[PDB]
Design a protein around this ligand. Structure first.
Ligand SMILES: Nc1ncnc2c1ncn2[C@@H]1O[C@H](COP(=O)(O)OP(=O)(O)OP(=O)(O)OP(=O)(O)OP(=O)(O)OC[C@H]2O[C@@H](n3cnc4c(N)ncnc43)[C@H](O)[C@@H]2O)[C@@H](O)[C@H]1O
Ligand SMILES: [Zn+2]
Length: 218
């Protein structure tokens, strides 16, 4: 039941770590990328407009993104704790989150930053593949399918997501590296920032996060 933000550049492993943390601790995963993808699959106006930002590797504007996050954090589950992933991405979003959480009386406990050098991030994102049937994630180096091009579960054809090609990855890295040092400083000045080396086996990265949360459990 903690209030945790996972920070990291695109490809750092936030979603992968978040599944392990939700599995074990039961707090809801709040991912702005998953909320925009849900809205896009439902073909809402906001989801289709968000797609132009997502496919070009740019940030959706602050005002609409803050509004969706504010609405989701207002739900009863988030009163127990939450794992934010992908938000905040600009200092304006982080200031907005401070005002939202101040109103809720729910200060952030940790901001866990997962550090991975950009050269590794480019390989992590460009080699990801997604199942067109079930949406399961594969990685051509780190987590390959049994057979190339095909999902192990259902026979679905794998694809590269629109924003994981090298041109879009380069833009995503540029756009988020610009915001990274101001956001890290914001949270290090608040004394909630923990840096974790993400260039390791997922189980090792997870153990270094888990040992923090288990300290609170005990
Ligand atoms: N707040 C906001 N404001 C404005 N716009 C916003 C917004 N939030 C979202 N958006 C918009 O939505 C877009 C997408 O955003 P968002 O969905 O937040 O995506 P992201 O964080 O850029 O990056 P990924 O989700 O691609 O990375 P991840 O850190 O979760 O890595 P993962 O575990 O998946 O792993 C990646 C790969 O690496 C592999 N991997 C993971 N861990 C390891 C490891 N330890 N070793 C080797 N491989 C690993 C995985 O198998 C996988 O293939 C944005 O570009 C923007 O357009
Ligand atoms: Zn599948």
């Amino acid at each position: 039941g903690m209030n945790i933000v996972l920070m990291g550049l695109p490809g750092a492993g936030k979603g992968t770590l978040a599944e392990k943390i939700v599995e074990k601790y039961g707090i809801p995963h709040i991912s702005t990328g998953d909320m925009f993808r849900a809205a896009m699959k439902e073909e809402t106006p906001l989801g289709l407009e968000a797609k132009s930002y997502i496919d070009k590797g740019e940030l959706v504007p602050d005002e609409v993104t803050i509004g969706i996050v504010r609405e989701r954090l207002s739900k009863s589950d988030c009163e127990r704790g939450f794992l934010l992933d992908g938000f905040p991405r600009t200092v304006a979003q982080a200031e907005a989150l401070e005002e939202i959480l101040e109103e809720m009386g729910r200060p952030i406990d940790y901001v866990i930053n997962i550090q991975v050098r950009k050269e590794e991030l480019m390989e992590r994102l460009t080699g990801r593949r997604i199942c067109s049937v079930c949406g399961t994630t594969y990685h051509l180096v780190f987590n390959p399918p049994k057979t190339p091009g095909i999902c192990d579960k259902d026979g679905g054809e794998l694809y590269q997501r629109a924003d994981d090609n090298e041109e879009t990855v380069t833009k995503r890295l540029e756009v988020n590296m610009k915001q990274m040092a101001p956001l890290l400083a914001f949270y290090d000045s608040k004394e909630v920032l923990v840096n974790v080396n993400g260039e390791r086996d997922i189980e090792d990265v997870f153990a270094d996060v888990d040992v923090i949360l288990l300290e609170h459990h005990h």
